[PDB]
Design a protein around this ligand. Sequence first.
Ligand SMILES: CNc1cc(OC)c(C(=O)N[C@@H]2CCN(Cc3ccccc3)[C@@H]2C)cc1Cl
Ligand SMILES: CCCCCCCC/C=C/CCCCCCCC(=O)O
Ligand SMILES: CCCCCCCC/C=C/CCCCCCCC(=O)O
Ligand SMILES: CCCCCCCC/C=C/CCCCCCCC(=O)O
Ligand SMILES: CCCCCCCC/C=C\CCCCCCCC(=O)O
Length: 373
Amino acid sequence: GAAALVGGVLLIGAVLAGNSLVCVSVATERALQTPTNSFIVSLAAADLLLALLVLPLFVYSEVQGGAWLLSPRLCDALMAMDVMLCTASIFNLCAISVDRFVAVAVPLRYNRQGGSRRQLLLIGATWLLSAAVAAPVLCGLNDPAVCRLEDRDYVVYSSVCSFFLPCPLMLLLYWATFRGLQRWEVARRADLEDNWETLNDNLKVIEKADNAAQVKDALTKMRAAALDAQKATPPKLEDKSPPEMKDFRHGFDILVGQIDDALKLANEGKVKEAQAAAEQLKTTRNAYIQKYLAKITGRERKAMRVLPVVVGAFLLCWTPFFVVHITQALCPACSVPPRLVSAVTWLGYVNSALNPVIYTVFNAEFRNVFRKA
Ligand SMILES: CNc1cc(OC)c(C(=O)N[C@@H]2CCN(Cc3ccccc3)[C@@H]2C)cc1Cl
Ligand SMILES: CCCCCCCC/C=C/CCCCCCCC(=O)O
Ligand SMILES: CCCCCCCC/C=C/CCCCCCCC(=O)O
Ligand SMILES: CCCCCCCC/C=C/CCCCCCCC(=O)O
Ligand SMILES: CCCCCCCC/C=C\CCCCCCCC(=O)O
């Protein structure tokens, strides 16, 4: 009993603190405001809701040796929430894989600034779907001194719908996505990184230049780097002929054109004007260039490194739970030691504390936002 209490309090504390720190960090920091991180916030919410609505009465139950002394309707409420929040977590890991696959497979360019908010819409769908899976639990599925899902048909249904069916689908999509990105990565990575650096560095030289000569020299180096980068063809388009190739180079053509206009200004000694033109180059790079540079240099694939770790931890933490529960539901005679049933439940809930740690260790932006304690 004391161990359930101690472990339980620590668990609830860790989930609340870790996941709130994630939510607030995506809130405070512009560098964490990305499409992927919308889902990460959603997952954090699921874990916060778990710590607030489910874990306390779960811990209380465990201190009372598994006994349930409260009403059966409250039990039904708790179990529906339990099922929904577990399902929401999984469906959101699924949604990330669907979102990232579409981002990689379907390059889009918008006229208007900003995102489409399609991630928000997908996240909303994810939660409604999870509620749909969980909804029958609220209507009362049990035949009573314990709080368990006794309906064997329902348990098989949800085990399949919430876990054994989405997990293979999500693993296939993550795999296609990573393979998809690899195809965009140029062989001569270091050369393109050099070009990218020459661009970003000299933009900074231009901002703090003392005179027109320095601005002109920097612009000249940018021009050279832009033209070099324009020749770095990803393997995806290497088998293409001079359509697709028109899209790729066109961005660099706009950039060089703007650099040329800026050079004329710098050459005439119009430093202020040349500097303002260099700032408009920053926006062009963001529009037609920067997203594709990060893809073709291998940076976007690198930034996705944290996702397999999150998925891996989830599978590690929840696979025993679902194997135990579907086995029981399929085969009453397949007697699982109550002690093990309890163990795999704790392991499932411990996952809700792990993700903040995983981000901090395995994702650069979260890690850097952390490291400035
Ligand atoms: C997403 N699919 C499921 C999820 C479940 O729990 C997360 C369960 C489940 O059986 N949960 C039981 C029911 C109650 N829960 C522990 C608990 C929570 C709150 C108060 C007391 C006990 C247990 C882990 C079953 C399914 Cl099919
Ligand atoms: C059951 C625990 C271990 C299973 C973890 C599952 C990992 C989910 C992600 C799968 C996609 C492949 C990820 C492998 C590293 C990236 C590959 C690459 O860079 O091309
Ligand atoms: C790729 C499959 C991952 C399987 C699930 C991983 C579970 C996550 C648990 C956290 C362990 C953290 C310790 C790792 C330290 C090494 C980090 C590093 O080398 O960069
Ligand atoms: C600001 C990041 C959002 C998450 C906040 C942190 C949540 C709890 C994590 C802290 C536990 C730290 C465990 C040690 C790993 C960090 C070490 C490192 O930075 O490399
Ligand atoms: C996606 C993660 C990996 C999944 C692991 C494999 C899942 C296996 C789960 C089901 C095994 C339970 C079946 C045992 C009783 C079956 C009754 C019978 O044989 O008639």
